[PDB]
Design an enzyme around this catalytic site. Structure first.
Site, short mmCIF file in Angstrom:
data_model
loop_
_atom_site.label_atom_id
_atom_site.label_comp_id
_atom_site.label_asym_id
_atom_site.label_seq_id
_atom_site.Cartn_x
_atom_site.Cartn_y
_atom_site.Cartn_z
N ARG A 59 31.08 41.47 35.10
CA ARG A 59 29.82 42.41 34.97
C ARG A 59 28.57 41.88 34.73
O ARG A 59 27.47 42.59 35.49
CB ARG A 59 29.99 43.06 33.74
CG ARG A 59 30.10 42.15 32.37
CD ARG A 59 30.10 43.18 31.01
NE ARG A 59 30.27 42.12 30.05
CZ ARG A 59 31.64 41.85 29.52
NH1 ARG A 59 32.59 42.25 30.16
NH2 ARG A 59 31.53 40.91 28.84
N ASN A 60 28.30 40.55 34.73
CA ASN A 60 27.14 39.95 34.68
C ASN A 60 26.61 38.95 36.08
O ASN A 60 25.90 38.02 35.91
CB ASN A 60 26.67 38.98 33.52
CG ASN A 60 26.51 40.00 32.15
OD1 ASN A 60 25.83 40.93 32.38
ND2 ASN A 60 27.20 39.49 31.11
#
Ligand SMILES: O=C(O)c1cncc(-c2cccs2)c1
Ligand SMILES: O=C(O)c1cncc(-c2cccs2)c1
Lengths: 295, 291
Positions: free
Chosen positions: A157-158
């Site tokens: 997600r990052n």
């Protein structure tokens, strides 16, 4: 109210604000067009992402944004990290201008490229492509580690993907010591961040580059499951028990035993026995060269 | 979507309409049509070198979606680049008027027709047939190196030029891998699913290795001189044959080695199938050792 830094300063009128892009721990970030971002390219526009403060933002919220910007200036530039491009700090709200990744985070990128439903994707990833994403994230992590930056929340997600399919680590300069974390807080997607945390960071609140390597192992697992969600349906209290008992996620289908062993090494119970990102970059580099793209 | 009133320009491909004379129609499809044409001045330094070429364009009843599919094909061709064993992009008239995509013309039709018309009562030797296969493998190795997945490799999609060179066609064709009607037949009355790898047919998973499977059926087509695979077998029965691990039998006038090459291409495990790089290498060796 804020000091001027002619290194990164861009005139507010050189920025055309567009649609939102945040609402995902990234804060309120919007897409924009920067004119003459470069001194030698005054008549050229570049799409960029812009971070700023919300309506009701305490003087503290402002503190953290400024530090993230300072952090980025110290860390420096690298192909595999979201880079700092400029900032608007005079006469108006604070604007931190960073690289824009048009294909979103890695989790979404992978899910949208999963094989046909028996869901109908328009693009598919070869095995070489997958190992290549793993390699780039490790490259970005190695650079960050070399600058003594500990990420603390490495996860797909990052990781962001540019229009050219380059992987970029984001949120590496995020304000720290906020480790007063709520283990039960869900991500905007509904997953628990504790599932990517090394046991020592989770139980003894100790964060090091070795704990980031543990997260990278979970990330590798995410890449090979095409955005799979770790420990689905497992609540925090049960996760603690799984870790205390030395449980380790199972091998993804379509994953060589070598890549799975790499994951298991990143999940070593003893921090000092885990490989380093320098070692991971080298291994992944070799493996990429040998992995088939079905050619 | 701005292509509604005007299309984007590309000078390094654009050809003046006055330098193109449309002629006899070559083929017809659901999306568009192809006509024969003589291009005056395709190549630089030769502004009078009339070249016979094929022109792809939409039919009168086309929609915005058809237009964008033809544009995509054209773009994909620019991106894929040139190679001797694929149909190449030569030009295009995109401004002021209907979109014309100019590609290479193959005067001897598709491979199936070419082989049928030459079955021994100038016919082909054993070396020639192996040569045809080599050429196709070479074209496919190039495409695969450019990330192109054909999805419908068959003799019907291989064209033959005046100089007998093999050229893969329809490789840049924008196709919806879902709206596939297994019962839909080819102009010649055959069922495309007969060329489809089991994983692509059951899981819609198309890889360069699924093209290798199709290549094996095309090999069989070459050595049967344009024979029809599984004649009289309907779609439902074909599925059952595949689940049973059934494999077409060895054609007469075909070596055990070439037959093993076909059976290898028909491995249930895609990773166990050879790659086009290995097929080109083996066929190169085999061609040399062929009479
Ligand atoms: O959310 C996106 O699509 C997106 C795209 N590009 C960049 C970003 C961010 C950079 C730095 C913090 S967020 C976010
Ligand atoms: O039908 C023929 O003889 C013929 C000959 N050359 C090219 C074509 C093409 C049709 C569509 C793309 S290339 C067709």
């Amino acid at each position: 109210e804020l000091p001027e830094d002619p290194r990164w300063e861009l005139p507010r009128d050189r920025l055309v604000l567009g649609k939102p892009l945040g609402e995902g721990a990234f804060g309120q970030v919007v897409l924009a067009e920067a004119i003459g971002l470069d001194k030698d390219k005054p008549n050229r526009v570049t799409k960029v992402a812009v971070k700023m403060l919300k309506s009701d933002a305490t003087e503290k919220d402002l503190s953290d944004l400024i530090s993230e910007m300072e952090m980025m200036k110290m860390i420096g530039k690298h192909k595999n990290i979201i880079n700092l491009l400029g900032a608007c700090t005079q006469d108006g709200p604070l604007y931190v201008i960073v690289e824009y990744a048009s294909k979103g985070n890695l989790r979404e990128y992978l899910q949208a490229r999963r094989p046909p439903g028996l869901h109908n994707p328009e693009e598919q990833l070869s095995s070489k492509d997958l190992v290549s994403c793993a390699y780039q994230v490790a490259r970005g992590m190695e650079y960050l580690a070399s600058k003594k930056c500990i990420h603390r929340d490495l996860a797909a997600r990052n990781v962001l993907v540019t229009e050219d399919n380059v992987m970029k680590i984001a949120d590496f300069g995020l304000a720290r010591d906020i480790h007063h974390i709520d283990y039960y807080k869900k991500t905007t997607n509904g997953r628990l961040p504790v599932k990517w945390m090394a046991p020592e960071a989770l139980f003894d609140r100790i964060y090091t580059h070795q704990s980031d390597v543990w997260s990278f192992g979970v990330l590798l697992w995410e890449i090979f499951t095409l955005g799979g969600s770790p420990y689905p349906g497992v609540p925090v209290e049960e996760l603690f028990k799984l870790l205390k008992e030395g449980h380790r996620m199972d091998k993804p289908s379509n994953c060589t035993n070598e890549l799975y062993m790499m994951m298991r090494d990143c999940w070593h119970a003893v921090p000092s026995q885990r490989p380093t990102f320098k070692q991971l970059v080298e291994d992944l580099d070799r493996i990429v060269a040998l992995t088939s793209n079905q050619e």
